[PDB]
Amino acid sequence: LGGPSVFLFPPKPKDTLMISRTPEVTCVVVDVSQEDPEVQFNWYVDGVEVHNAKTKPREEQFDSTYRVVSVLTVLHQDWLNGKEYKCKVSNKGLPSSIEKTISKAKGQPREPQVYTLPPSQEEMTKNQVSLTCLVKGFYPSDIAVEWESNGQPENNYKTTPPVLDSDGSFFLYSRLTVDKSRWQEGNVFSCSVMHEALHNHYTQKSLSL
Amino acid sequence: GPSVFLFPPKPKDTLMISRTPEVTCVVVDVSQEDPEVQFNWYVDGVEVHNAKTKPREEQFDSTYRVVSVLTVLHQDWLNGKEYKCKVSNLPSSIEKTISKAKGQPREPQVYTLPPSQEEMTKNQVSLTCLVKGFYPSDIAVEWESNGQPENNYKTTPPVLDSDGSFFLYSRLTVDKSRWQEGNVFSCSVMHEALHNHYTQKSLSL
């Protein structure tokens, strides 16, 4: 039937694991009619209502409909404790109030094993080589992977999405492309992995020649 | 009303001449009061007739599902020929059209990586096969050992790189004793940009 639609998005995994960042649960409604644009939000954390949400003004889409977004800042420890977050939306374009609920992935968390793999000797003929970081056996799939060397971050890398393995855990690979000289000259490269099952939600493994 | 989906042939079917690739046209949500459906297939605008149509299977939904399958020529799909499917269930027909991804093929580099020494403390180890610098993303990866096929592996999806090419990883899990006894493992990769559409890289202790 006709009327607006309500979506509720979880925080970025990286925002959850780092305390220097800010994890957010976002409730966004679309297809809000111009004839009835006024939208009210109501947030609940495990049934208890919170009021610290920040609602952005109605943005008019291309087709005269409106998009309204309400964003709620959550606590790192709260989200990881599995606390449920509810978003209730009230609008005249809807026959009734609609509630959506989101929470952390359920299931026993498993610590990721991190292994660094040196380049293949065959790839040593090309100008740049591939440093590989294998992260496996972790649960849930929310994870973050970065690269560092000499303190400064190396930003020339890509990371495959989490893949479900036979034992119900995930695995992925991260590939950092470096100039051969920097690898031949014996520099130390560190694969950084962040995950809720790790000690202090962080670990790193070095890789050199 | 009913809706139509069109699916490409499996990447492995298009590369190995032994297998036969097929495009599949699916029609769902067919009302019980109107199950009569006709299909029309077109190759680069030219209509073909060598397609086989499965019977109307009923769903729990009290609606029906009709599936049409067209056999395609291996070289046709590799050249970018367009396959269109027209469905009529009444002057209101729905068209769907699909072909191979546009662009110049780039052959993949295959590198076999041994398990990290830190993993030797576990009962099973990981054999890593890196496939990079290929286009398009259509690719297939398998594992063999002493001729016999290995099945305990998992392959990541193709990941788009910076130079407009793709890369992926494939990870085979074997018992540590298998690896320690110097058994030979090989990573096989089938891609259109490879000579004979096939290459293999060995890996052992």
Numbering used by the authors:
A (entry chain D): 235 to 443
B (entry chain C): 237 to 325, 328 to 443
Q: What is the paper's account of this structure, in its own sentences?
A:
We now report the crystal structure of enzymatically deglycosylated, serum-derived human IgG4-Fc (degly-Fc)*, solved at 2.7 Å resolution. The asymmetric unit of the deglycosylated IgG4-Fc (degly-Fc)* structure contains two interlocked Fc molecules related to one another by a pseudo-symmetric two-fold rotation. The deglycosylated IgG4-Fc structure that we report here also adopts an open CH2 domain conformation, dictated by the interlocked nature of the Fc molecules in the asymmetric unit, with a Pro329-Pro329 Cα distance of 29.1 Å. The patch exposed by the absence of carbohydrate in the degly-Fc structure is partially covered by the intermolecular CH2-CH2 domain interface, burying a total surface area of ∼750 Å2. Asn297 is deamidated to Asp through the action of PNGase F, and in chains A, C and D, the Asp297 side chain adopts different rotamer positions compared with Asn297 in glycosylated IgG-Fc. However, in degly-Fc, Phe296 faces towards the inner face of the CH2 domain in a manner that would not be possible in fucosylated IgG4-Fc due to steric clashes. In contrast, the CH2 FG loop in chains A, B and D of the degly-Fc structure adopts a conformation which is similar to that found in IgG1, and folds back on to the CH2 domain. On the other hand, in chain C of the degly-Fc structure, although residues Lys326, Gly327 and the side chain of Leu328 are disordered, the positions of residues Pro329 and Ser330 are more akin to those of the unique IgG4 FG loop conformation. The degly-Fc crystals belong to a hitherto unreported space group for IgG-Fc (P622), although the same space group was reported for intact IgG4 crystals, and the six-fold crystallographic axis generates a hexameric, planar assembly of IgG4-Fc molecules, in which chain A from one Fc molecule interacts with chain B from another. Thus, to form the hexamer interface, a structural change occurs in the CH2 AB loop, in which residues Ile253 and Ser254 move away from the CH2 domain.
IgG antibodies are responsible for antibody-dependent cell-mediated cytotoxicity, antibody-dependent cellular phagocytosis and complement activation, functions mediated through binding of the Fc region to Fcγ receptors and C1q, respectively. The Fc region comprises a dimer of CH2 and CH3 domains that are linked to the two Fab fragments through the hinge region, and an oligosaccharide moiety covalently attached to the CH2 domain at position 297. The oligosaccharide not only orients the CH2 domains but affects Fcγ receptor binding and complement activation, and therefore plays an important role in influencing IgG effector function. In IgG1, the FG loop conformation is conserved, but in IgG4 it adopts a different, unique conformation, consistent with the anti-inflammatory properties of this subclass.
